[PDB]
């Protein structure tokens, strides 16, 4: 009646028609709310450390267009989106679609999503040309998943990290003890947050904790401890950023740029930051814009060990999805296919 | 659901046909999952001082061909492999097989494993000729064993070392009490890990603990404690690297090299550095390359007591499998056969 209520972390509101739409089942007899959304949460938990909250679905939204949907983060609207009626979504090129495929509607719901919508009546031909397509419900799932991917910091806090560490305690009481006797819980969560901010999964807790148990005996800096955990994930990072190929394809930095960055460190009374020379930062960004070819996959930038974290923070603003990795973080025997040298 | 899952250390994924294959007991009635894998684990735990994890077997994998298999370390793919259909593996010289009118398929699954595959129809012939062969299931076990051996450090951490010390506590309460009173669990874990990192078995926990119980009264450096444990395993080391003969075959160092290494940074830093000139490290590495005739078993490099650990930390990157031993680790009556110094 008049107790407090906890704010709901994620709301999905649907217009009258999409609400009418979540009543069917896919050709595989699965439910949007009981199967598709849980499987998305499960996939996200496998892709990075986080166990993301459930999705509260509000049907027949009054403030919504029947074919519109809205995502609310902590009961505040985060993103609106639209579904072109009676279509399926596609990721096809603009010269390939000039293969008599009439519906070339471009409407981008989000950055990381496809935008080439095609009539549902064309499913048959889409399946005959090896064109993958997403049904409108699957597009909603794509967008929810993208949302979770870009906003991990919103769902990985002190309580959530503690819950995962406690689960670890059941079979690793002594490793956790050795990890809780050196790094207090708040510092631990800061470290996990830095990891997932750069798409480093924190799912392999035994590896990460074993790493911290080693490096936390000597170093207390949370940023450095994070670097070490990264260097502990050689197999994972190599497999992820090489996309499972025999060779990681990366961009490099001209040694001149690296040494120039190296010469901009700070005194670490509190922390050591980048003494970003304005004009030099805008010159490195310009060389990156004019060297890294745009993408459909995000590109990978391989740098020296001692500058990687700085390169990330120098570039994270314009190139937020570019992965900056270091030699300390790839397998010793890994094949490297250089693509360019930023100058 | 809402709950976490513990990452699986070892997954073996099998295509359709290999999956069918593990459903049949061998000629002698043993099961791939119930007998072969357990016995391999027991053997590894008999050679190295590690208890290796169980293997989770995923059949009818979607991403694998009928005769393909994959090994995942902590749910990241480690390696992929093939089995030539309806064949058995042999180590025969290819030219000899040809001379026996036996068509052969060449395929090397992992480093140091045989590669001459022969139709299973040839078993009888191979038996009468006393030619060794491995069935497909046996080859998967061979590759699994190579994997576990290369990945030992992945299974030897704080919780696992604690588990060992626990088992030791049941019959050696006071010896454990003496060692753990002097060495914390994390330091103990470091020492065991150093031992297996250089192929020294930690199966004889009584000898290792007794050694530590003696030397931890006086010495706290974990590296020096490790050296002492190494010298306490004289019998094990002599038998292993002499391969059981009345004489160990070794390479030696020039007195000039030993004296030159002997300039080593030993500060009060819980472990001493080794400050040798870069070009000098490259001159010792060059002399080793030009003096170590490659091996068809690994070679042994015999050094003086006070330089052994440094010699290792100097050659381990380019010469990773060379066993570096000292006069302190071999039996006094084991005859030293010298294969030339290092210029």
Numbering used by the authors:
A (entry chain E), B (entry chain D): 363 to 658, 662 to 708
What do the paper's sentences say?
The export apparatus is composed of a central, nonameric, ring-shaped inner membrane protein, termed the export gate (CdsV in Chlamydia species and SctV in universal nomenclature). In T3SS, SctO is the key link between the export gate and the ATPase and is poised to transmit mechanical force between the ATPase and the export gate.
The crystallized protein contains residues 345–710 of CdsV from Chlamydia pneumoniae; several N- and C-terminal residues from most monomers could not be resolved from electron density difference maps. CdsVC displays the same fold as homologs MxiA from Shigella flexneri, InvA from Salmonella typhimurium, and FlhA monomers from S. typhimurium, Bacillus subtilis, and Helicobacter pylori, with four distinct subdomains (subdomains 1–4). Monomers of CdsVC align with RMS deviations of 0.26–1.68 Å; the primary differences across the nine subunits exist in subdomains 2 and 4, and in particular, the cleft formed between subdomain 4 of neighboring CdsV protomers, as evidenced by the high B-factors observed in the structure. The closed, planar ring is stabilized by the buried surface area between subdomains 1 and 3, with an average total interaction area of 1127 Å2, as well as several salt bridges and hydrogen bonds between conserved residues, as noted for MxiA. The CdsVC nonamer has an inner pore diameter of ~60 Å, with the total diameter of the ring ~170 Å. Residues lining the inner surface of the ring, which correspond to subdomain 3, are highly evolutionarily conserved across prokaryotes with T3S injectisome machinery and flagellar T3S, while residues along the outside surface (subdomain 2) are highly variable. As was shown for MxiA, conserved residues lining the CdsVC pore also include several lysines and arginines, which are critical for secretion.
